[PDB]
Amino acid sequence: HCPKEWISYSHNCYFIGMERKSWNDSLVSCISKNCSLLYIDSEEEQDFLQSLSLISWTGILRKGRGQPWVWKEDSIFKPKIADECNCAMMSASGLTADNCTTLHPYLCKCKFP
Amino acid sequence: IQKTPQIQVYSRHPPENGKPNILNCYVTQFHPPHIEIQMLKNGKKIPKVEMSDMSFSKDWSFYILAHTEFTPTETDTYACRVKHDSMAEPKTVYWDRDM
Amino acid sequence: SPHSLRYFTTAVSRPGLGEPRFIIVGYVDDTQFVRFDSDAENPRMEPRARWIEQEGPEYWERETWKARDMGRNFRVNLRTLLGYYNQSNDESHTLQWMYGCDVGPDGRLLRGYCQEAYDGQDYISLNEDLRSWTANDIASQISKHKSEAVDEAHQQRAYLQGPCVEWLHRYLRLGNETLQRSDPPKAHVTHHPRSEDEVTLRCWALGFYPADITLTWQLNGEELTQDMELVETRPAGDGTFQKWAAVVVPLGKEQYYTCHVYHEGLPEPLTLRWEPPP
Amino acid sequence: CCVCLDKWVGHQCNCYFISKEEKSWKRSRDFCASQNSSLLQPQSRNELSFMNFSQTFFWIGMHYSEKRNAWLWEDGTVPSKDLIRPEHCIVYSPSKSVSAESCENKNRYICKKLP
Amino acid sequence: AMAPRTLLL
Ligand SMILES: [Br-]
């Protein structure tokens, strides 16, 4: 049971942030609402998220130039990510690297009990 | 603002009197894209004229290649008639084996 | 050495003759490979190169689908633009969109494009940084503001750096034997008596691939002094190109004039002269 | 509650099915009918507010009444904005665009679950 | 392949 103004897909709640924030602030804003910055589990979910046709900060991030992209909890889905562009964003063309400091919208996955 | 089409009428292969060939009409540097291209045999229109897909250059002006099956002869006069918004009268360019 | 994937889209409005004509033409390295025309018997993405036929119905379906949405949106965009410029519906108006990839021998993006023109004039274009747009007037400033609200620049940059680059690589290997082929020019010299004391010597270069060529005339083994007539390179319509260079020479001076053909499909350049029958 | 079946999207206590597949208008409304739903009737301005950025066109529950000689919703209701040929069927973009097209043309669709 | 989006003017 998600709030009326939000999106409900596969027992998870989704909402867009009111503002365009940096990667960190976008991660911080989701946590503050008992949700998490968008994470991808399946292609069916990714394709549904591409249907919304929005720019969204994704949870997937890298520590540096040679450091690998980090995501956990044994979910094999790791899509193709297209400098200081060390953070991954979701678009209509799939996952794309971008500068964490640049302001982009963000989507939170809540998953109510 | 309109751009006046530039025309080139020529054969695909070196012409030989009696030997069948392809006649080309290369129309370029024009705007707006609405254009009428007629290929002629002794002043009369040719029905089966194949058009290339309407594309444009980076200066936004359109270009198109019209073509028809023809047979070069010393007697027959071949041409390309072009009707475009930029010209009050149609532009006719004759085919010259020499160019 | 440089490689490119580009799409040229055109929506040209009809004065009561139904809906506007919608065209998309795809080019890989300056040669057409796919086309969509709303005026064709059954509008769909059609192959315009033999090597793209290697794509399964899954590819064609996806592209026919993208094109049908594009046309609808370009039609709506034409109706928005008419209202912006307070134009009569009874006239032919045109909206153009060019976008694509520029890669070097290094398989990475050199530059990305995403620009539009309304009635032959620039409207809105994506900057080299691929983060901001350039408007040209009030109407385009409204369209820039609309694009900003839906983060269009970021969306286009995503495509330009990702799928556009990746697909270009797939196309480059798919039609390598054609794209990077070398058709040598077949050169000959025609004689045309221009005046009572003058002659036109026309040096032809036919059936060559790629289109890049250098045709030059030399008087007694030295570069042109007079004005040289030359046609703009033209397609033969079979995949190859044609071009000619001409010179107005005095009568009896034909042999003291030599033509030089410079094309990558030739191991050594071609040296040509007018060959008179005995 | 206000939850939806697998692959469906819930918003404002309404269950929507956004198609991946292209189908004719008749077959699309026939698919919606079987899932005890119907094609979307976006008489409300921003029905698909969550889909607002989408440029994609989907079939909607609109039918031309040859007797009343005007456009009508599957409901029987009469719309008022964004509109022409009676023989054509309507596609709607969540970005509020509306386009007429052949009913035998294949297109994506949106089913809205009935109560 | 083509871009999934165009500019909505
Ligand atoms: Br928030």
TrEMBL record, chain A:
Q: What keywords tag this UniProt record?
A: Adaptive immunity, Cell membrane, Disulfide bond, Glycoprotein, Immunity, Innate immunity, Lectin, Membrane, Receptor, Signal-anchor, Transmembrane, Transmembrane helix
Disulfide cysteine pairs (residue numbers): 2-13, 30-108, 35-110, 87-100
* Annotated GO CC locations: plasma membrane; receptor complex
Start and end of every C-type lectin domain?
Answer: 9-109
Provide the protein's localization.
Cell membrane
- Gene Ontology MF terms: carbohydrate binding; MHC class I protein complex binding; MHC class Ib receptor activity
- Its recorded name reads Killer cell lectin-like receptor subfamily C, member 1
Q: Which organism is it from?
A: Mus musculus
> Which portion of the entire protein is included?
110 to 226 of 227
